[PDB]
Every structure is written in structure tokens, then in C-alpha cells.
Amino acid sequence: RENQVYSPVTGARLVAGCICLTPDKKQVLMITSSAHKKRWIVPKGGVEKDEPNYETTAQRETWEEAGCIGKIVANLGTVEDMRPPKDWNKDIKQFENSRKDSEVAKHPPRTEFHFYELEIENLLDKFPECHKRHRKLYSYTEAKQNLIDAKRPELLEALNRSAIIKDD
Numbered sequence: 001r002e003n004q005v006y007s008p009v010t011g012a013r014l015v016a017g018c019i020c021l022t023p024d025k026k027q028v029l030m031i032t033s034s035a036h037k038k039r040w041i042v043p044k045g046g047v048e049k050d051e052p053n054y055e056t057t058a059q060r061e062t063w064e065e066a067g068c069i070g071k072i073v074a075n076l077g078t079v080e081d082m083r084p085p086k087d088w089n090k091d092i093k094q095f096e097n098s099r100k101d102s103e104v105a106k107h108p109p110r111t112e113f114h115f116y117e118l119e120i121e122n123l124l125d126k127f128p129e130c131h132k133r134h135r136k137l138y139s140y141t142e143a144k145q146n147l148i149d150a151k152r153p154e155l156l157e158a159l160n161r162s163a164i165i166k167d168d
């Protein structure tokens with residue numbers, strides 16, 4: 001429903017999420033997509049009109065989607081979902097070409113993500129989406145490949161800004 005908040009500039013939907021790390025920072029918590037049962041992503045969801053800050057949305061979504069509780073130790077800033085609209089590929093105009101580079105035709109972002117780094121304090125076996133998704137820890141290398149397989153580079157960018165140990 002329209003409790004959703006949008007960028008007043010780009011009309012992008014405003015989303016907050018967490019990069020949930022283990023205390024040793026060797027692993028990150030991932031959840032399976034609802035629409036696509038095999039795509040592994042990280043907890044995130046739409047900011048609602050009542051919510052006073054992005055941290056609120058991020059910790060609410062981390063609980064609802066991944067039954068995870070922890071403390072926010074870092075602001076990982078913003079990343080954007082620059083996937084083109086559903087209109088794309090049945091359009092006449094598709095790409096915009098430079099002399100030494102190629103780009104997708106200029107379009108507004110779908111989503112603006114505000115990500116936080118969380119240190120996991122507890123994982124509970126029961127949470128609101130406990131039967132709708134799976135949830136598992138992955139090393140950096142495993143995590144990175146999951147996000148490419150999920151076709152979500154903006155989520156990998158968020159992961160890369162975290163303190164996750166990448167030497168594994």
C-alpha cells in the first residue's frame with residue numbers, strides 16, 4: 001500500500017537495509033528473494049511515512065525478513081538500483097553510445113537504498129517471514145557470487161563498503 005516514501009527529486013522509492021556481519025566480520029547474513037526462491041540478497045525494504053529515520057526501517061526489515069537482531073556499527077551511505085523500466089527492450093531507443101564507451105539510455109533510478117552495517121547479536125528461529133524465505137551466513141567470496149547471480153550489483157557495492165573481511 002501507499003505508506004511508501006519516494007525521493008522528491010528522482011521519484012525513486014526510498015528503501016533501507018542492513019549488511020548484517022558476525023562479530024569476527026568473516027561472514028554476512030543473506031536471505032532468499034520472495035518472488036524468486038533461488039536469488040540470495042540482503043535484508044531491505046521500503047521506508048514508511050511514520051518512520052523518523054532510515055535506521056528504524058533498516059532494523060525493522062532485518063527483523064521481519066531475516067529474524068536478525070543487532071546494533072548498527074556503521075552508515076554505509078546510499079546505492080541506487082539503476083535497472084531500466086519494464087518498457088525497456090520493446091522500445092525503439094535503447095542505448096546511448098559515446099566514442100570510447102557504451103551506456104543504457106538515461107533513466108531515473110528505481111530505488112535509492114540507505115544501508116547500515118549491523119553486528120549480529122542474536123538470530124531467532126521464528127520471525128514474520130520465517131516460512132516465506134531462507135536465511136544463511138556466507139563468506140565474502142560466497143556473498144559476492146550470490147549478489148552477481150541475483151543480478152544486484154548495487155547490493156554488492158553496499159557489501160564492499162562494510163568491514164567484512166574480503167581475504168578468505
Ligand SMILES: O=P(O)(O)O[C@H]1[C@@H](OP(=O)(O)O)[C@H](OP(=O)(O)O)[C@@H](OP(=O)(O)OP(=O)(O)O)[C@H](OP(=O)(O)O)[C@H]1OP(=O)(O)O
Pocket residue numbers: 013015032033034035036039041044045046110111152
Ligand atoms: O519492497 P522490497 O524492498 O522488499 O522489494 C520487493 C519488491 O518491492 P515491492 O514492495 O514494490 O513489491 C521489489 O520491486 P521493485 O521495487 O524493484 O519494483 C522487488 O524487485 P524486482 O523488481 O522484482 O527485482 P528483482 O527481484 O529482479 O531483484 C524485490 O525483489 P528482490 O529484491 O530481488 O527480492 C522485492 O524483494 P522481496 O519481496 O523483499 O524479496
